[PDB]
Every structure is written in structure tokens, then in C-alpha cells.
Swiss-Prot record, chain A:
Organism of origin: Homo sapiens
Lineage: Eukaryota, Metazoa, Chordata, Craniata, Vertebrata
N6-(pyridoxal phosphate)lysine: residues bearing it: K239
Pathway in which the depicted protein is active: One-carbon metabolism; tetrahydrofolate interconversion
EC number: 2.1.2.1
Protein name as catalogued: Serine hydroxymethyltransferase, mitochondrial
Keywords per UniProt: Acetylation, Cardiomyopathy, Cytoplasm, Disease variant, Intellectual disability, Membrane, Mitochondrion, Mitochondrion inner membrane, Mitochondrion nucleoid, Nucleus, One-carbon metabolism, Phosphoprotein, Pyridoxal phosphate, Transferase, Transit peptide
Designated gene of the protein: SHMT2
Consequence of changing K428 to R/E: Does not affect succinylation level or hydroxymethyltransferase activity
Disease (UniProt): Neurodevelopmental disorder with cardiomyopathy, spasticity, and brain abnormalities: An autosomal recessive neurodevelopmental disorder characterized by global developmental delay, moderate to severe intellectual disability, spastic paraparesis, ataxia, and/or peripheral neuropathy. Patients also exhibit dysmorphic features and congenital microcephaly. Most affected individuals develop progressive hypertrophic cardiomyopathy in childhood or have cardiac developmental anomalies.
Amino acid sequence: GWTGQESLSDSDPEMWELLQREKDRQCRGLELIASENFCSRAALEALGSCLNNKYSEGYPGKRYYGGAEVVDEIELLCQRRALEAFDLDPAQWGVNVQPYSGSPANLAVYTALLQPHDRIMGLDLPDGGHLTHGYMSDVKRISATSIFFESMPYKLNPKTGLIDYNQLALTARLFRPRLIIAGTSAYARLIDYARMREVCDEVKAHLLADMAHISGLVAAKVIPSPFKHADIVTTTTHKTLRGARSGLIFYRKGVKAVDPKTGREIPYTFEDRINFAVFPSLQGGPHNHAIAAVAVALKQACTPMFREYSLQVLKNARAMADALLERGYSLVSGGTDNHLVLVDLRPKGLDGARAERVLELVSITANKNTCPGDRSAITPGGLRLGAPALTSRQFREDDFRRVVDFIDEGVNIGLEVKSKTAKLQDFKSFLLKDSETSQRLANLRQRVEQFARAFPMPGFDEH
Amino acid sequence: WTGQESLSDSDPEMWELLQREKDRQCRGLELIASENFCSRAALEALGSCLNNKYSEGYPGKRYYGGAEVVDEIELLCQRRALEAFDLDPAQWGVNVQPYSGSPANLAVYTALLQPHDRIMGLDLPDGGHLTHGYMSDVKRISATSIFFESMPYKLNPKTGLIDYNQLALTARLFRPRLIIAGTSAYARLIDYARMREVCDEVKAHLLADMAHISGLVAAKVIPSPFKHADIVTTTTHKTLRGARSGLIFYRKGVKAVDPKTGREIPYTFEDRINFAVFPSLQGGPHNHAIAAVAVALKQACTPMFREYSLQVLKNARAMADALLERGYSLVSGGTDNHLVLVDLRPKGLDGARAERVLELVSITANKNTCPGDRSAITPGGLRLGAPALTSRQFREDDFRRVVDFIDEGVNIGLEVKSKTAKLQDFKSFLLKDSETSQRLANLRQRVEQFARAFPMPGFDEH
């Protein structure tokens, strides 16, 4: 009979086609999403392993079922590698490595610390926050966070394009939040974690730091560490950490503050609550296969290799920014200080939705973005470009400068098609239907795919 | 650094751990009702380039583009999941994004119910799952019991079956909006037909968490809960022998054209179920797991997987009949499923003692609270699971042989019990005592020799 040892190639050749088609797409394309990245073969070997076949319900040395002597060493190693990666003292810090992905990691923390219908503040979604930080329409609550808890957004200053820390302090005093969130999806500059902390300390609230995008940078110490000012830090292990899709939750432990009036020490009460909310509250069975893959990625994060990568990522953002500025493009917050280069297309007479679709057609995956004063919510006037993706294929300043030329030609096609159509649906149809436009795009595509294929791609060759 | 270096060369600390866990799995007799050995085909898909794609949203309606290939994958995973549980795509849909089993349920609760609405599920010690809702005397333990108000229904201690009589009685008082038809530790089948009558009367939704029996339901070797339930959650890694993920099957199209008004009434599950998955609870879908699940669902459709599932049932029967004929007492009489609920009080031993001893001789089984027990720390009873070893091509004769090893293990447990006081002591006496140690070390070797011979799905090394 069937052994279950048959290769995917032979076993399910419908699925094997699809793996190779998505592998080819990744290699011939210019990936320009800030959240995307190309994962190591080392980690993907661990991801697709026999660790799939273990129910290690619980935590090391406190499992529901036994026979977990090996996975305990793995989960404990993943911890000591995560503490080492963000250079944390195991006396002062712990970490939970179980979170299935980034989103659950945050929900775990909310559940661990807050009661239902407690008050949460995060950067607003169109100002560049994530759904997980809490988001409601006028008509309906959209985030799970905004259902179980009461979320109020803090916003940017439309002028500077920065987090209005002045108004954040103003609203907190009124709203009385118990947790304020220090993270972004679309924000070029850094976060004044120091100031955020002062706001919380004053309004007697917790400071969560969702360092999803910056995790790879923070690890390498090419950015200031939010661990200096925050007590709770959530993260994805797959954004700039270039690992498998999982999550982490860093938390404080030991002594908080020895009260001089009483004289006795006050303990941090995060560790027990954070872990209890992960399991047995929100999640169930851990994905030991992902935990292993994450520990391999955290091992890489500690190497000097990954530092130089992260130093290059920054310069490839700088390079891409300076290249755009010098083609008459407007960047939100003027320039980037990280890995993403928020772009404003209103001042070149184009929107995100038009640019996005055209770039996609020439094998350039980038995402539209809402830029301050963008009138139509439907069609955000702006674009978000991401270094880390291509930098992992060993790109350089010259290569990113070359990327922007391809982008620019794409934008010009966009501009020219815009004045020969009315609304977006028309624009998107004119790209496919029109013979002249089609061939102009087909040409640009070839040159882009030719350009991309040359550069190496981490992971396997075939899948 | 290319990032194309092998794990072997790259991180040889981690590579040792993979081989040690691979050896543990091969030399051990895995007897957990959840545990199963996943195919190489699916693990190849799990550890693939699909990790490196943010498919936020749904097919044809992604937040970011460049998802033409993953759309075909996510859509294929759907058509394979509908085909696996023989569903009409006119009448049924499915969401394939759930990260794991637990979130899949939380998605459904969030999709259908308001915060602090009323949920009923089999109690935890009676054999439910934490996700169905569980509170202590002092504090709410389940996330479900925090956001929503959960009341358990229990077994009948006499029969060892779901007291459908009292479920109907309490449900008229409690007025639940959602009742859950699933188990972790229950040998016999669920009268989904009766559960439905309860709900229909108390105007409630019937969720069917078919985690443990998903592989059986697929192969059509037991009752389909799709006949009586409208919502069906499942893990893709229990008896479906797939990668670690979750599904949510739901109704769609027309429910009932009301003859008074005359107009058709739609099922309003599809949009709410999907919205709760994304963009409410989850973010970036694990396309690598979705692919692995689609590979496993392809296998579930084959006649091969039927003969596996027919064998799984007989290997449960075989193990049950073998135990009954050695003086062991099974709860619920027997097993029409894949698990046997054993009672060790009538042979003068508890679960915690048996569990620890069997573990030491490479036999992973889990303790289980026999109905009417109350010893929490020391619950008299054990849960044995076919599917694990059946996937290594075990037979009735092999499972009969498994019980011999178990029996010897129990006897060692009994003998150590009368030479010790508190459980904590018992567990130390196993390690410390020279006579006991060698008797265990002997049993271990014979078990490991026995096990290694049988084949193991997946890779040879990792």
C-alpha cells in the first residue's frame, strides 16, 4: 500500500505544477512589498519536517501529553535564540514562540492584559496602522480587536506625515486607554518609543510595540531598539526577520520597582498572563514545525551576515527614495529612515490603484497607500515600496536605481492611459484591450523579467 | 550567503534535533487520538516558496496583487475540500485560511454570535475541547468563555454517552444561540440528528467540530455530520493525515422559501464566516499550509484512504476486544470510532501512573477522566488512538500485540504502586529503583525493535 513516502512530484503533479509556477513568478518578478521577503532553504527544511506530527499542547516541562523530550529542547532553544537575537537578558525578559502568526500574537497580548471592552489606542489604518491595532468604519466594527475591545485611533500630522505625539497625549488623557500600540505598516520614519512610553506612564497604561516590519532591522541594531522603552513587544517572524510565517511575544519578568515606602520588591505579572492567553485560552496545538523554522531564522538574525544585509536594506531604501525624489516624485515624510519609501502620486497626477495595476502587469508587485489629504478613500493617491524583498536577492544601490527607471516607465504608461480613459474600471480594461499599450507593457515586462532572473533566489530551486 | 544552504550544513544544532524527533517517532508506539504521521507529498508543499507570499484577502479580491498562482491554489484547496466531504458547491462553501483548529472555531463564534452570547458544548472532563468553552470554579480558562457565555452539557455516567435528554432540558432554560457537536475523548458517534432537533427547537445554530473524525467522515466509514449540521469546523491533521491547518464548511444559496411571504430566504453564513476569518481575526494566510492541506485532501478522495479509514476502525475494534479480554473496562462499552476510552480504576491504577510508565517504554498515550471521577491530578483512565500506527500499516494482529506491551506496562505500574505512596513518589521510584529501571529498559527495547520495523510516512531524516 501507499507508504506516504512518495514525492509530491509523483504523488500530486497538479499541485507540483502550481509550486513551480509560483517559484518562477517570484524569480522573474521584482517583489516591492515591505511585508514580503524570500525565506532561507535552512528554515523551509525545518518547516516541512516531522515536527508537524507532534501535539505538544502546553509549554516545556508542562505538556498535556508526554513524549515531548525533543520538542522541549526545540521550543526552549527557539526562546534562547529569540532572546539572543534582540539581545535581551533572560533575567529581565521572556518570550512566547507559539503564536501561529502576527495577528494572533497581538490578540494574545490584548486577552492576557485587558478585560473585554477595555480601551486600546493604535495608529489609524489609513494613517498606516494595522487592522490588529483596531479599526471600525462609520457603520460597522471591522477589526476583531474593535469587537471584543474598545479601540480609538491616534493619527498622523497631515503636514509633517509623522505620528502626532502632541495630540496622542491630548486624547489619551480623555480616552483613558489601558494599552497604546507602537507599530506601523506604512510609515517611512521611526517611532519615538521614548515619548509613547511617557504618554502611557502618565495615563497609567501598557506600551505594546508591534515591531512587525522593523523586527529584522531592530535585531541587527541598524535602528534604535523599542525594547529600551516598551515592556511588551509582538512581532512577525517573516517580514524583515526573513523567517517562516509565525509570531513572537516578548515580555518583562523579575522585579519591576522595589517601593521605597514599604521596602518590598514588586514583580512583573506579564509572563504568566501572556502565556495563559496563548494557551490554554486562544490557541490550541503548537506548530512545532514553524517554531523550528523560526529558531533557524533567529540563528541567522544573530550572524554578522544578517547585519550587513540589514545595513544594505536601509541604503537600498535611501537609494530608491533619492532616485524617486530626483524624478519629480513626492515622498510622504519627505524621506525614509527604515526599509519602506511611502510615495505620493497626486503631485505627478496619478493614484495608487492605477500605478499598482500597471506595475503588476510588468512583473512589479507593489501596493497602493493612502497619503495625507487623499480625497477618494476608493483610490488612495500613493504607493508603498519595500527594499527587504529584493535586497535578500543581493541587490545594491545601482540595482534599485535601475528598478525605479522600470517603475517610472510604468507610471508614464499609467499617466498616458489615464488621459485616454475616464474611471478606474475603464483604465484597467484599456490596459488589456488596447493593442499599442499592450505591446509597450509586454516590452517593459520582458526587460524587467530578464533583469530579475539574473539575481539569486533563496530557498529551494524547484519549489 | 545565498540563503540556499541546507539546514544540515547551515544550522547543525537544529539538524540534530530533527533527527532525534524523527527517531523518537519511528521507535515509539504513538497512541494519541490526535497524532498522525503526515505524507511526504504534503510536507514538501508545507516547506515551499508559498511561505514567501502575502495573499491578504480572498481569491480575486486580494489586498495586494501578484497572487494569480496562489488564487488557483486556494481555489483548488476549496474544490478538493468540498469533494473530500462530498459536498454540493451549490449548497456548501468552505474557508481554507484558518491557521489551525482552535482559531477555526473562534472565527465561527465571532462570525455568527455577538460578544457574551450563549454557547453550549460537551464539558471538558466529559471529553469536549477547550474551544467549546471551559471555566474553573475560580476563573474563565477558555478564550471562548471570556468573550462568550458558555454552559456545558455532560455525559450520562451510566451509559457513558452524551445525555441528549438533559441537553434538551437545559437548552430550554439556558437559551443558547450555538450548540457544538464535537469531542476529543468520546468513543461512540454523535446523534447529530437529535442535536439538530434540540437547536431547531431552541432556535440555535448547530456547529459540528469533527476534528477527530474528519478522516473517517471523508472516507464515509461513519455518519456524516453534514447531513444534520449547517456549520462544520475541522483540523486538517487528525485523521485527515494532512498538515496543521483548519477548515470551516458553511451553507449557502436558498434556506427556505417562506410560503406565507412567498420570497426565498438566503443562508447568511458565507459572508459573515469569511469576514470573521479576514479581515477580523487573521491576517496573512499561510499559503504553504493551504497547499499541503490541498495535497492531503487529494489523498482523502482516493479509494486508498478509504481502506486506511476502514482499517483504522477495525484496529480500534481489535484493540478494544483485546483489552476487554484481559480484564480491562472500556467506557461507553466499546468504540464505533478510532479511540478506546479505558478505565483503570477496576484494575487498581490511575491514568497518571499508566501514562508515565507507558511513556518510559516508548508508548505515548494520554490519561483521561472516566465519567464520575474527580481526582483531577490523578484521573483513572486512558485514551488510546489507532490512526497514528494504522498510517504505519498496522493490522488487528499488530494492535493485539500492542496491547500485550501496554498490559506489561500496566503490571509494572501496579507493582510500583504497592511499593510507593503519593504519585510524585511513584514517578521518582520508576527512575531511581534499579530492579524497576531494568524491567522498563527491557520492555522499551522490545517495543522499539517492534516499532522500527514498520514504515513511517514523510522524509527519512527530517
